[PDB]
């Protein structure tokens, strides 16, 4: 597991890769910004954001919830995401 997370290639462990693939990823190797890209696609596509208060994402009965280990997060409090990423990315 990484401690500190430009252009550097990551390989996501299988649980994360599944979510990125559902989001549309055609790849096994990603940049960090390609991971964030597909992660936001996933929330969009699955409509996990709260529809009145769209900074809030409800991820509780979803494979993403399982990864983040929270029922909800705020896009303005992105810690659960960054922490999940260092738990789920192999940094070569």
């Amino acid at each position: 597991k990484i401690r500190t997370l430009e252009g550097t290639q990551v390989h996501p462990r299988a649980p994360l890769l599944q979510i990125l693939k559902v989001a549309g990823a055609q790849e096994e190797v990603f940049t960090l910004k390609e991971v964030m890209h597909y992660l936001g696609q996933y929330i969009m596509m699955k409509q996990l954001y709260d529809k009145q208060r769209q900074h809030i994402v409800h991820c509780h009965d979803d494979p993403l919830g399982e990864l983040l280990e929270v029922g909800s997060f705020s896009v303005k409090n992105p810690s659960p995401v960054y922490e999940m990423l260092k738990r789920n990315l192999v940094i070569l």
Binding site: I43, M44, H55, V57, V75, K76
Partner: peptide, 11 residues
């Protein structure tokens, strides 16, 4: 604001 506007506004 929409979720995707908020999302791309991230470090």
């Amino acid at each position: 604001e929409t979720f995707s506007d908020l999302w791309k506004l991230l470090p």
